[PDB]
Amino acid sequence: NLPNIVILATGGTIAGSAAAALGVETLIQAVPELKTLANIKGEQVASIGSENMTSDVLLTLSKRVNELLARSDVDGVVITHGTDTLDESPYFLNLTVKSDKPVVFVAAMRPATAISADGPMNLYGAVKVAADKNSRGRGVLVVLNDRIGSARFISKTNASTLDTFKAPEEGYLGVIIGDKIYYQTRLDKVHTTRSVFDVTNVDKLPAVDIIYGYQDDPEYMYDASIKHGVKGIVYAGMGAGSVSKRGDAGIRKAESKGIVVVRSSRTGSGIVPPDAGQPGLVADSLSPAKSRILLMLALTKTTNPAVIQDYFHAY
Amino acid sequence: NLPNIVILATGGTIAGSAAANTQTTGYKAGALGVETLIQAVPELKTLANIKGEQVASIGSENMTSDVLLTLSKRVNELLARSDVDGVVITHGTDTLDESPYFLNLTVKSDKPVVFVAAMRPATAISADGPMNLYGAVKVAADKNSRGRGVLVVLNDRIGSARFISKTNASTLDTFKAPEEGYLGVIIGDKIYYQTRLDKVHTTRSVFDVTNVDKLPAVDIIYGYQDDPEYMYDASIKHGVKGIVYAGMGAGSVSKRGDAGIRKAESKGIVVVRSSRTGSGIVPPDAGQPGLVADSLSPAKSRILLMLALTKTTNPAVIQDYFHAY
Amino acid sequence: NLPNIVILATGGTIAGSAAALGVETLIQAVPELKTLANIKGEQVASIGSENMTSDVLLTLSKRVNELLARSDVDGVVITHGTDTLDESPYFLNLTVKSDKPVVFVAAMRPATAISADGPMNLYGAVKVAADKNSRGRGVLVVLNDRIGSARFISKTNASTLDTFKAPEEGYLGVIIGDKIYYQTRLDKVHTTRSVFDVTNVDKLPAVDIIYGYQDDPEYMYDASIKHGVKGIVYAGMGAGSVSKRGDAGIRKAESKGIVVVRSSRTGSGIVPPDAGQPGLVADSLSPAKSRILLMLALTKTTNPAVIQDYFHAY
Amino acid sequence: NLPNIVILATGGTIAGSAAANTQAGALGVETLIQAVPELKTLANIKGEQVASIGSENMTSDVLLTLSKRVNELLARSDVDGVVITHGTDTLDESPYFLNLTVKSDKPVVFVAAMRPATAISADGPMNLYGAVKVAADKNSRGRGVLVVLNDRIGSARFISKTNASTLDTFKAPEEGYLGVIIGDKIYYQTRLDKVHTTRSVFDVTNVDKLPAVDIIYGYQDDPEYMYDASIKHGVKGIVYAGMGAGSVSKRGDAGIRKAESKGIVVVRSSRTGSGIVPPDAGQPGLVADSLSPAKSRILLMLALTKTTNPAVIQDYFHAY
Ligand SMILES: N[C@@H](CC(=O)O)C(=O)O
Ligand SMILES: N[C@@H](CC(=O)O)C(=O)O
Ligand SMILES: N[C@@H](CC(=O)O)C(=O)O
Ligand SMILES: N[C@@H](CC(=O)O)C(=O)O
Secondary structure (H helix, E strand, O other), rough: OOOEEEEEEEOOOHHOOOOOOOHHHHHHHHHHHHHHOOOEEEEEEEEEEEOOOHHHHHHHHHHHHHHHHOOOOEEEEEOOOOOOOOOOOOHHHHHHOOOOEEEEEEEEOOOOOOOOHHHHHHHHHHHHHHOOOHHHHOOEEEEOOOOOOOOOOOEEEEOOOOOOOOOEEEEEEEEOOOEEEEEOOEEEOOHHHOOOOOOOOOOOOOEEEEEEEHHHHHHHHHHHHHHHHOOEEEEEEEEEOOOOHHHHHHHHHHHHHOOEEEEEEEEOOOEEEEOOOOOOOEEEEOHHHHHHHHHHHOOEEEOOOHHHHHHHOOO | OOOOEEEEEOOOHHHOOOOOOOOOOOEEOOOOOHHHHOOHHHHHHHHHEEEEEEEEOOOOOOOOOOOOOOHHHHHHHHHHHOOOOOOEOOOOOOOOHHHHHHHHHHHOOOOEEEEEEOOOOOOOOOOOOHHHHHHHHHHOOHHHHHOOOOEEEOOOOOEOOOOOEEEEOOOOOEEEOOOOOOOEEEEEEEEEOOOEEOOOOOOOOOOOOOOOOOOOOOOEEEEOOOOOOHHHHHHHOOOOOOOEEEEEOOOOOOHHHHHHHHHHHHHHOEEEEEEEOOOEEOOOOOOOEEEEEEEEOHHHHHHHHHOOOOOOOOHHHHHHHHHHH | OOOOOEEEEEEEEHOOOOOOHOOOOHHHHHHHHHHOOOEEEEEEEEEEEOOEEEEEEEHHHHHHHHHHHOOOOOOEEEEOOOOOOOOHHHHHHHHHHHHHOOOEEEOOOOOOOOOHHHHHHHHHHHHHHHHHHOOOOOOOOEOOOEEOOOOEEEEEOOOEEEEEEEEOOOOEEEEEEEEEEEEEEOOOOOOOOOOOOOOOOOOOOOEEEEEOOOOOHHHHHHHHOOOOOOEEEEEOOOOOEHHHHHHHHOOOHHHHHOEEEEEOOOOOOOOOOOOOOOOOOOOOOOOHHHHHHHHHHHHHHOOOHHHHHHHHHO | OOOEEEEEEOOHHHEEOOOOOOOOOOHHHHHHHHHHHHHHHHHHEEEEEEEOOOOOOOHHHHHHHHHHHHHHHHHHOOOOOEOOOOOOOOOHHHHHHHHHHHOOOOOOEOOOOOOOOOOOHHHHOHHHHHHHHHOOOOOOOOOOEEEEOEEEEEEOOOOOOOOOOOOOOOEEEOOOOOEEEEHHHEEEEEEEEOOOHHOOOOOOOOOOOOOOOEEEOOOOOOOOHHHHHHHHHOOEEEEEEEEEEEOOHHHHHHHHHHHHHHEEEEEEEEOOOOOEOOOOOOOEEEEEEEOOOHOOOOOOOEHHHHOOHHHHHHHHHHOO
16 A cells, blocks of 8 residues: 655765765665655665766666556656766656656765765655655656755755755755655656657767866867767856857867757856857756756757757757 | 046956847947946946056957966056056956956955956846946945955945856856855945955965966866766876866766876876866865865866966965965 | 737836836836837836735736736736735735736836846846746746746845845746746646635735744734734744744634734745644745735635645645 | 863754654753764863753843853853854844854854754754864854854854755855865855954843844734834834835834834844845834844844944944
């Protein structure tokens, strides 16, 4: 009679130890309170720092997620993950998961052996959220610090705080307070069941690099991407994707070689607006790191700029 | 009879023209002169005797350190004069993260140095420029602005060069510091100071570019999943003196990054691990290469690192700098 | 071919003169509205929103409902002051019953100020209202290039242009470079799905807001009691926490049939249920929005459990 | 060798228990101290139990007691600083009281915790550690009264509970934090540009009862009678939690004026949660500057022990 939730562990600080790494079965054991929310099965997809998360491991994760959500005896899925790269992995699965069932990413800033470690509660909130049927159809979820954020908006905004994960402009989809879920907001983009993206039959994703925008920014960074035959480049623009004349050169250069370039921003938030005056596609409100994921996945369907641009406004 | 303020222009949307007023995105930055700017706010004659000066007429995307030196040498030139009470600097927003901070390190006077910008062209409806400029001259003329570090004014806020930054691509209230706030606000034609910068700045800064003609080259390299090593090889192949890593979370290096950083350190390039995050502390970790950016943005870390390398190549001296400025 | 939009004028700083105004002056001032829609102006009232009252709200609410029921009205823009934009839009959010966009707009600076925000806000509001894609999103609050939900957004700073924020909830959408980007949707009961109708209401119940604080006087409840208020909202310390003096005074009111909601003086967040304390609980609703919900709920029911649920659903 | 730090306990959720860890009985100061053995690496601790209450119930009387005692401790050469355990519900006020009230350079760090000590991932232990770390840094000196939760060091003058229930609640969007605590080092970033502690004129050393000040909220249809009830019960000051920038409706206008008739001092603050309420000649009452309703009661309250002069009280609000 209780929901059947699978915890796929991938590593991260939620799984570390010290005197201030640890497998899935322990994370579960450190919170016996999980018993009261779901029947839990644990599975170890990887044990790496999320900084070392790569498109390849994401292909395995995504495939295993869809494989499990296809099952009649799996109600939702909770994914244990680091925070340094939690910007990208949930957005990946938001684009790539074929189910309506809850996929929920959980993480912690303090390791399990820290004074007032956030992992235990984050995990509890994440399983509770996953075990809720009202949690379906919401897109991939990101749960830490009592907040349920959308994979499309939520990112790490502070380097070291427990409350890092924010989306200033779009808030949190909802909230977990006093052992109650409080949904307030619904993502208004294409995701999960409605997404045209399918990585089920993909062995390898196209390479996509990220170039920063800044005063005196080198044109030779683009030459690198161009040389190594990268498929896409995400410019992390000054302000609203603004390019200097080196950005301009580098980008236009890349574009003649058939490299799809998307101008995002280095600011943290907001719309990069369309502009005939500048080269490259526009990222809408997509962060540089999430733009990479969308571009990377977009480059498995098409190379067409207007089409991909279309994705960038809808996804 | 009243304070003598000088406005030094560098271009930017504050001085952008556009064909129509409904249009907010995609125009000509630095199309108009400091005199056109000043003329549109005749209210400034209530605050200051104003002299305008055109240092540059570029969009701040194209702001180069070469113009920064020139600008920094000029501010110091003026504030040393008896007839100059404070400077206002009109500037783009795209790169207003870095120019204020630069002069925060290189200005040598108590006097107010207030950068000012607009998110909307002068032609836009409800253009923020005039009010912003009014506030900028206000702050500058007020003796009580003295010794507060270099200041950034937009949207009735007075932020510190050290903390403030463009936090949104396109909104008027872009310039924020979640963790540090604003030194002061401007409300009902009054200045309210609330905060002071608890870092080293201006008069007490050890960095002096009065006689420097070429600042050392510093590249920023982003952190992300599947980040390539070859970007580090690129900076090395080009004789760069410092690299700022815009790291994942608190400057976390991937395998590729660790190796890339480490190649750079071999050939004597100083590496600072900053954060793509947007705020907060990158703490020392002796299990990771390069030094640590404290709470300085990749943009700002690039500036300090650059100016640091004019003084020393000592990794420990520079690490001290990040913790102090 | 171009959408029909009625701008309903209520007053506010968006319509103020200085030495450093009717709906038609406002319209005249943004000639670019003509590119967005065909515009009719109406002056519902001309007050500072600080002087906005339930009975003017009713007049407005019915008029809005009346306008939106026409074939030839596509949407409604309400010009209004900021000091009470917390309340007015939420009111309409529950009482309106078309999917047609109802867009409140305001300005922190008067039209005469350097870099006055009125014109641009008014432009945005109309653009939003004239967009087919705006339908059925609940009542909206446009200022400073954001589309806020009436359920969430509130004045968070006394005097800045960007005052209107909902930290926990962000914006519904945004207006950048002359285009609208919708991003999130109100996951609460609103407009067409709301049970709250005021068509047949002449006077709304009286509801007071009492502030929570160290040494808070119990007599404030005694006062609200003397004047036979129907409901009290408590702007509690923290998550709606009562002192002994608040505990007893609320319990006092509750025994006289007055319905008490416990909200927060904090600015955001959930006041969770608690059997150890009296009053109902305000979910994430502010004190000012709690008033609007409670006073409307009092037109329907006096039943604590039903009222309580409204606060979790609406 | 190590700094001597006194912990003064007043109660609060930091000292709060519950039946299960997934969700109240009181816990002593020494229970809080033994829960964190790592404190001994930071300082010598003395525990002192001043009160044991929810901060809902914190009164101006106990704050007087809390003040006199903190001044008495800090006056000693062998006391380097004091950490105060206090509920979150009324940390808006107590800290600011002490900020005007303490005569010492020496750190006064308030600490609290949003989740009970009993709760899974409870925030009490780490918060206090932080609070003691700050109180035992000699660099915490001369910064005014300090508030530590969620790794942040906030100024008493600015910081407030902005969310009902979350861990990161205590913010000040316009002013930020004075410092933060990250990876077991303190990082100072900002200084309070206001009169505080040693420069304050507010002396309650010989004050037994504080004047009464009510807070009356501003809203649509706001009743004039709140003001009358304030008046009837001999209140010496009223703080107005106004609409926008302390804006008064016809009723608050009449009501304030009435209270001004009786020599009740009124301050127009704001219900919004941040920002400047400007002077407006065409409106009654004094003006709060950027002070919240809660902190305004506190500043008004103390000003009325010193003076009843409208001009002088207004100066306090632009200075403190
Ligand atoms: N390096 C860690 C950081 C964290 O989880 O907080 C990670 O795996 O992402
Ligand atoms: N592209 C412009 C943006 C602005 O100033 O608002 C610049 O940086 O010059
Ligand atoms: N007093 C004005 C303030 C404003 O609109 O900004 C009002 O009507 O609310
Ligand atoms: N009721 C508690 C709330 C808390 O501390 O979290 C108090 O203020 O004492």
